[PDB]
Write a protein that binds this DNA or RNA. Structure first.
Ligand code: MN
Length: 745
DNA sequence: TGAGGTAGTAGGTTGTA
DNA sequence: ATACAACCTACTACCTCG
């Protein structure tokens, strides 16, 4: 066996309680509230004074060294108050801020390859290291001949205990930017209209996209009224723009939509946002090179943070403070509790299934109401490839005969399907306007002889002729007719190949067509812990001013889906009204009632989303309905990656390994081997209840093993995950009865 | 959209100290 | 009576799957 760890570093030696210098601030300016301008006075006095540390207490300000009272600042008149040795047990936070400042100050000076400063730093938790680590432990730059720069963005976040030992929390991430800019684009003469950009010289909310390039000169009076060069002279940014040569002032104005008004800027002032789209559009070979760099297994992350922490060395302003290089031998010494969950025993038609894959030799758990008829929209120039593809998937689904060869790996009649090419209908479509796609789906609606669509779509790639997926999904959703779609690439794979890649494609295709007609393929044999039904919820927070409604789901102790639900009436902002909770749980109790003849006696409410709800609603509710219950909150994205240790060897964890502290616990739900990344585990936090977190983790990991639209695990469990997919697909709600036939899966 | 895993990139909002 | 750090959302790209 083996241990687990969190990526953290214990500091050798301790922090001594140092003499800190108090400073009050007062709002001379228009913002009388200093609490809304404490950061601005902080950063200005920290800036103007050799970047000596300038910290923030609840309403005051610290420096570790003596900086005089400076009152030139038009909003803040900083004055000295007292000089007291700050007790560490009073402020864990400010001594952690010291450890942060001293790692940033030790690491500013650290250069690489002689001239080159390694870590571009501005004294915060985020540390940009210019050089990288390869797999062979070489500090090398990674750039292209275009010029796209991979950079590690290290994240320190140190904390220090009551007496003075320090804990350094690290997490490494990749980062793209390019040394080029849009000025470097146009002086090279490339097209820029439509590009996502980032203004370093003015901080603007919303996401920026390039509208156009005016041929008008940047050195003339503007529609703002004065020249933009005077606009940045009044920005006091003259140390950058004074570097402008005659060709620099020869440049042209480039405007960019900023969701409120276009911004009249110069191309030098903008970098393009380097989404990985922009990489593959601008250097594919580089992207294929760095994909082994950005996805990181744990040995590589340990080498990366080992380089980082050796670049700390020893810091001496904290009295010869140094951090170790290794991780922990156990998280017990940090305060979490480890373990790995038993993998759930899973059952199918003939009882227990051994692999998740041989269900197609075992047959499905439950089949829906009888007989279903297929139907395919196809491109009129992609006919025979499509016909061989449908013949492959239907001979799989009915005959079990893999590209014309029967195998004992496939069982007959695994759906009770009805398809016959002399009987059925394939309406065709031309790859064209979306209104043709819509009227084609209507024409396949006008014959009431199809019971299930398998449409064919153009690809997720291919910016050419318009993608047919979403208008089909809208029009087939409003019919409440499920539709497992297939790309033309997938059609070519089924038509060309005879090999088992088409079998993998076909596995996921058939589990999709099952889970959309409401059949459920496999379920757990026995749920650990005594629970009747699960309840998902989530609310999406999409853009500025977006307040979504909670879409539930309800499973059983077998975990098979029973009902999901969309509320009646609108909520109070994003804070959901209590009667929507009432309405949902009314549908929950009647759903489990008329599906199993009894009220639920244990309800696990896996919630994503914030506690805009109130627990005492649930307390009064399930006290009057006198049934115990459990609200485990699942938070989907967490930065705390987890590593395994086998005698110093740092590997990615096997799935189902967890770490736990009280009422928060982390756990990986997916097996990723080497070469592919570090598993980004789950965040689970029991807001209420009377069950041990061990059993809630066991139920969550089993509900990641019952994803029913794949042969592999969903990272989220099917409660929160299917709640999330429904909340993305809020246009795909049921017309009438809100029952089953998962449109998302 | 196989399909969902990691991975980035922007971006908004609170929950807890 | 207000923080800031996690969450969470949106789109892609890579890459594997008896
Ligand atoms: Mn699907």
């Amino acid at each position: 066996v083996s241990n687990l760890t969190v990526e953290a570093f214990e500091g050798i030696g301790s922090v001594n309680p140092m003499l800190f210098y108090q400073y009050k601030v007062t709002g001379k300016g228009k913002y009388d509230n200093v609490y809304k301008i404490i950061k601005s006075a902080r950063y200005k006095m920290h800036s103007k004074n050799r970047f000596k540390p300038v910290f923030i207490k609840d309403d005051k300000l610290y420096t570790l060294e003596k900086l005089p009272d400076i009152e030139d600042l038009d909003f803040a008149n900083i004055n000295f108050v007292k000089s007291e040795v700050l007790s560490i047990e009073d402020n864990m936070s400010i001594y952690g801020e010291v450890v942060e400042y001293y790692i940033n100050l030790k690491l500013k000076k650290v250069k690489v390859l002689g001239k080159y400063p390694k870590y571009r730093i501005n004294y915060s938790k985020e540390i940009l290291s210019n050089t990288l680590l390869t797999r062979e432990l070489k500090d090398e730059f990674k750039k292209s001949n275009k010029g796209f720069n991979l950079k590690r963005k290290f994240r320190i976040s140190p904390v220090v205990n009551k007496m003075g030992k320090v804990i350094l929390y690290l997490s490494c991430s990749a980062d793209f930017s390019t040394n080029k800019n849009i000025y470097e684009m146009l002086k090279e003469g490339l097209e820029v209209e439509g590009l996502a950009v980032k203004s370093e010289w003015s901080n603007i909310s919303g996401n920026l996209v390039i509208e156009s390039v005016l041929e008008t000169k940047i050195s003339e009076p503007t529609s703002l009224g004065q020249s933009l060069i005077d606009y940045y002279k009044n920005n006091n940014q003259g140390y950058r723009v004074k570097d402008f040569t005659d060709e620099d002032l020869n440049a042209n104005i480039v405007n960019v939509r900023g969701n409120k008004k276009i911004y009249m800027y110069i191309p030098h002032a903008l970098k393009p946002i380097i989404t990985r789209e922009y990489l593959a559009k601008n250097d594919p070979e580089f992207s294929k090179e760095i994909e082994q760099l950005i996805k990181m297994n744990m040995n590589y992350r340990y080498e990366t943070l080992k380089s980082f922490v050796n670049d700390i060395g020893v810091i001496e302003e904290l009295n010869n403070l140094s951090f170790k290089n290794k991780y922990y031998e156990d998280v017990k010494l940090l305060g979490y509790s480890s373990g790995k969950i038993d993998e759930p025993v899973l059952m199918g038609a003939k009882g227990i299934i051994k692999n998740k894959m041989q269900i197609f030799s075992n047959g499905f758990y439950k089949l829906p109401e009888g007989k279903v008829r297929f139907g395919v929209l196809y491109p009129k120039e992609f006919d025979g490839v499509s016909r061989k593809a449908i013949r492959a998937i239907y001979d799989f689904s009915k005959e079990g005969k893999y590209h014309g060869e029967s195998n004992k790996y496939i069982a007959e009649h695994l759906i009770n399907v009805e398809f016959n090419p002399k009987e059925c209908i394939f309406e065709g479509y031309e790859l064209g306007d979306i209104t043709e796609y819509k009227k084609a789906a209507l024409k396949l609606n006008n014959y009431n002889n199809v019971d299930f669509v398998i449409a064919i779509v153009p690809n997720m790639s291919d910016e050419e002729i318009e993608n047919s997926y979403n208008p089909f999904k809208k029009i087939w959703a409003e019919l409440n007719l499920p539709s497992q779609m297939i790309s033309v690439k997938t059609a070519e794979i089924f038509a060309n190949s005879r090999d088992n890649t088409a079998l993998y494609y076909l596995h996921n295709i058939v589990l999709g067509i099952l889970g959309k007609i409401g059949g459920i393929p496999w379920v757990v044999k026995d749920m650990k812990g005594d629970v009747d039904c699960f309840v998902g919820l989530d609310v999406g927070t999409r853009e500025k001013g977006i307040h979504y409604p909670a879409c539930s789901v309800v499973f059983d102790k077998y975990g098979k889906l029973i009902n999901y639900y969309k509320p009646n009436i609108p909520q109070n902002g994003e804070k959901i009204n209590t009667e929507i909770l009432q309405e949902i749980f009314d549908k929950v109790l009647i759903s489990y009632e008329e599906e199993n003849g009894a009220y639920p006696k244990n309800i696990v409410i896996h919630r994503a989303g914030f506690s805009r709800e109130d627990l005492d609603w649930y307390e009064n509710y399930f006290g009057k309905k006198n049934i115990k219950f459990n609200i485990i909150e699942v938070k989907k994205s967490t930065p705390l990656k987890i590593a395994s240790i086998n005698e110093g060897n740092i590997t990615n964890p096997e799935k189902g390994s967890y770490i736990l502290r009280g009422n928060k616990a982390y756990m990986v739900t997916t097996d990723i081997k080497e070469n592919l990344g570090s598993p980004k585990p789950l965040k689970i936090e029991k807001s209420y209840g009377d069950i041990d977190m061990l059993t809630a983790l066991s139920q969550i990991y089993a509900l990641t093993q019952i994803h029913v639209g794949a042969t592999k695990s969903l990272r989220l469990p099917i409660t929160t995950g299917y709640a999330d997919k429904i909340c993305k697909a809020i246009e795909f709600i049921p017309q009438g009865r809100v029952d089953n036939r998962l449109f998302f899966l």
